[PDB]
Amino acid sequence: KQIEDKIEEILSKIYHIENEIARIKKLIGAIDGRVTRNTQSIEKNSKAIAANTRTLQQHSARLDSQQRQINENHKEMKQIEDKIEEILSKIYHIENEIARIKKLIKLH
Amino acid sequence: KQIEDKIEEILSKIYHIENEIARIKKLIGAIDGRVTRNTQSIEKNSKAIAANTRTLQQHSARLDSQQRQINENHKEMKQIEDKIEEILSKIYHIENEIARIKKLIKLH
Amino acid sequence: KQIEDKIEEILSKIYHIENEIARIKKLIGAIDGRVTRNTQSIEKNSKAIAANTRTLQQHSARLDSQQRQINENHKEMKQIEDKIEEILSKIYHIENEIARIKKLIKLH
Ligand SMILES: [Cl-]
Ligand SMILES: [Cl-]
Ligand SMILES: [Cl-]
Ligand SMILES: [Cl-]
């Protein structure tokens, strides 16, 4: 009698337990799949970041080259300018020579 | 009798349950370690992305500067060209003066 | 008697089991929250990487344009230089004409 009441109490507990276990298992299966998906996406990200770092490095290399190019062009300009000064000097000298020639002719 | 048969049925259930519980615990321990690893890798990624964003910002700053440099060089050129025009003008004027001088000498 | 001893053994097992189940449930709840947080951070990362890739693409476009600009400026310079040569030639020719004029005047 009293033993049968105890056994009833025990059978119900076990029922409720088995049910918990099933639901726990479902929950765990769900999380497993979520985690794998996350582990997959992280790999994707890392791939995309390594890709980008390389592009950054290439761009850096291109910025350097360009800066050097610009410097050389800035210099070439200065050489050109220095050359123009010399030309202007010659031209003023020539203007003067022409004037002086004109004066000799005018006197004679 | 019948009670002993019930108790047998109960003991087996419990056995099978305890086994489930152990295997569930293993599964959960595994996922925990996977998750920590993922949480670690994500931090790595974020660090690498913040690193890259900064490089991007620095490059942007360098592109601006370079563009400004190029503009100034494009301008300096235009100044140089305008100066050359003036030189060519003077040179044609001089050529003309020389010709006219030659004519005076030829007449006399 | 012996049955009551068995039932005692069974009741304790169930107690210990229920406790395991609770603690398992807590553990699982914890991991769930960790995973969601990770899934959230990964999305953040992906957003930040797509953002950066676009910036990289824009920078590439700007490096191309700048390189083309620099090339044109390097060319314009060469045109300018070729023009200067011609000017210097004219100037030497003029110097010579002036000298020869001077000689005619000196003779007469
Ligand atoms: Cl995760
Ligand atoms: Cl990530
Ligand atoms: Cl330039
Ligand atoms: Cl990135």
PDB file of C-alpha atoms in Angstrom, chain C residues 27-99:
ATOM      1  CA  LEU C  27      24.949  25.755 -17.761  1.00  0.00           C
ATOM      2  CA  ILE C  28      22.981  25.595 -21.001  1.00  0.00           C
ATOM      3  CA  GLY C  29      21.257  28.900 -20.331  1.00  0.00           C
ATOM      4  CA  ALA C  30      24.661  30.498 -19.826  1.00  0.00           C
ATOM      5  CA  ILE C  31      26.088  29.169 -23.098  1.00  0.00           C
ATOM      6  CA  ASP C  32      22.963  30.298 -24.998  1.00  0.00           C
ATOM      7  CA  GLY C  33      23.573  33.886 -23.935  1.00  0.00           C
ATOM      8  CA  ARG C  34      27.264  33.653 -24.779  1.00  0.00           C
ATOM      9  CA  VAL C  35      26.440  32.328 -28.250  1.00  0.00           C
ATOM     10  CA  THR C  36      23.894  35.040 -28.992  1.00  0.00           C
ATOM     11  CA  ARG C  37      26.433  37.682 -27.939  1.00  0.00           C
ATOM     12  CA  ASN C  38      28.971  36.079 -30.266  1.00  0.00           C
ATOM     13  CA  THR C  39      26.497  35.907 -33.142  1.00  0.00           C
ATOM     14  CA  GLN C  40      25.839  39.606 -32.533  1.00  0.00           C
ATOM     15  CA  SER C  41      29.509  40.593 -32.512  1.00  0.00           C
ATOM     16  CA  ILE C  42      30.171  38.636 -35.725  1.00  0.00           C
ATOM     17  CA  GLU C  43      27.503  40.620 -37.472  1.00  0.00           C
ATOM     18  CA  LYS C  44      29.193  43.815 -36.258  1.00  0.00           C
ATOM     19  CA  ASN C  45      32.491  42.591 -37.621  1.00  0.00           C
ATOM     20  CA  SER C  46      31.059  41.676 -40.989  1.00  0.00           C
ATOM     21  CA  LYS C  47      29.473  45.122 -41.234  1.00  0.00           C
ATOM     22  CA  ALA C  48      32.781  46.795 -40.392  1.00  0.00           C
ATOM     23  CA  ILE C  49      34.678  44.626 -42.988  1.00  0.00           C
ATOM     24  CA  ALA C  50      32.209  45.332 -45.828  1.00  0.00           C
ATOM     25  CA  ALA C  51      32.596  48.992 -44.868  1.00  0.00           C
ATOM     26  CA  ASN C  52      36.377  48.720 -45.110  1.00  0.00           C
ATOM     27  CA  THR C  53      36.346  46.788 -48.412  1.00  0.00           C
ATOM     28  CA  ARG C  54      34.355  49.644 -49.959  1.00  0.00           C
ATOM     29  CA  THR C  55      36.857  52.206 -48.683  1.00  0.00           C
ATOM     30  CA  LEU C  56      39.663  50.072 -50.161  1.00  0.00           C
ATOM     31  CA  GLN C  57      37.877  50.059 -53.509  1.00  0.00           C
ATOM     32  CA  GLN C  58      37.453  53.839 -53.392  1.00  0.00           C
ATOM     33  CA  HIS C  59      41.081  54.330 -52.497  1.00  0.00           C
ATOM     34  CA  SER C  60      42.135  52.072 -55.380  1.00  0.00           C
ATOM     35  CA  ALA C  61      40.066  54.289 -57.648  1.00  0.00           C
ATOM     36  CA  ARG C  62      41.807  57.365 -56.236  1.00  0.00           C
ATOM     37  CA  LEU C  63      45.286  55.850 -56.638  1.00  0.00           C
ATOM     38  CA  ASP C  64      44.555  55.181 -60.331  1.00  0.00           C
ATOM     39  CA  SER C  65      43.338  58.709 -60.945  1.00  0.00           C
ATOM     40  CA  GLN C  66      46.296  60.200 -59.159  1.00  0.00           C
ATOM     41  CA  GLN C  67      48.734  58.020 -61.082  1.00  0.00           C
ATOM     42  CA  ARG C  68      47.180  59.195 -64.314  1.00  0.00           C
ATOM     43  CA  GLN C  69      47.435  62.780 -63.147  1.00  0.00           C
ATOM     44  CA  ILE C  70      51.109  62.402 -62.310  1.00  0.00           C
ATOM     45  CA  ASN C  71      51.790  60.853 -65.711  1.00  0.00           C
ATOM     46  CA  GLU C  72      50.154  63.772 -67.489  1.00  0.00           C
ATOM     47  CA  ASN C  73      52.212  66.226 -65.373  1.00  0.00           C
ATOM     48  CA  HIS C  74      55.375  64.271 -66.194  1.00  0.00           C
ATOM     49  CA  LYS C  75      54.445  64.603 -69.862  1.00  0.00           C
ATOM     50  CA  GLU C  76      53.557  68.288 -69.788  1.00  0.00           C
ATOM     51  CA  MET C  77      57.020  68.789 -68.357  1.00  0.00           C
ATOM     52  CA  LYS C  78      58.614  67.032 -71.287  1.00  0.00           C
ATOM     53  CA  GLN C  79      56.678  69.276 -73.681  1.00  0.00           C
ATOM     54  CA  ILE C  80      57.889  72.327 -71.735  1.00  0.00           C
ATOM     55  CA  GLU C  81      61.464  71.105 -71.899  1.00  0.00           C
ATOM     56  CA  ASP C  82      61.292  70.475 -75.620  1.00  0.00           C
ATOM     57  CA  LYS C  83      60.008  74.061 -75.947  1.00  0.00           C
ATOM     58  CA  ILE C  84      62.920  75.405 -73.946  1.00  0.00           C
ATOM     59  CA  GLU C  85      65.441  73.707 -76.169  1.00  0.00           C
ATOM     60  CA  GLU C  86      63.906  75.514 -79.121  1.00  0.00           C
ATOM     61  CA  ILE C  87      64.127  78.813 -77.237  1.00  0.00           C
ATOM     62  CA  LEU C  88      67.772  78.271 -76.368  1.00  0.00           C
ATOM     63  CA  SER C  89      68.464  77.530 -80.022  1.00  0.00           C
ATOM     64  CA  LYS C  90      66.825  80.734 -81.129  1.00  0.00           C
ATOM     65  CA  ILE C  91      68.804  82.594 -78.462  1.00  0.00           C
ATOM     66  CA  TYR C  92      72.122  81.247 -79.629  1.00  0.00           C
ATOM     67  CA  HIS C  93      71.189  82.075 -83.202  1.00  0.00           C
ATOM     68  CA  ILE C  94      70.364  85.609 -82.120  1.00  0.00           C
ATOM     69  CA  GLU C  95      73.619  85.998 -80.216  1.00  0.00           C
ATOM     70  CA  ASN C  96      75.387  85.039 -83.401  1.00  0.00           C
ATOM     71  CA  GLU C  97      73.432  87.499 -85.508  1.00  0.00           C
ATOM     72  CA  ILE C  98      74.302  90.272 -83.059  1.00  0.00           C
ATOM     73  CA  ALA C  99      77.950  89.426 -83.219  1.00  0.00           C
TER      74      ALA C  99
END
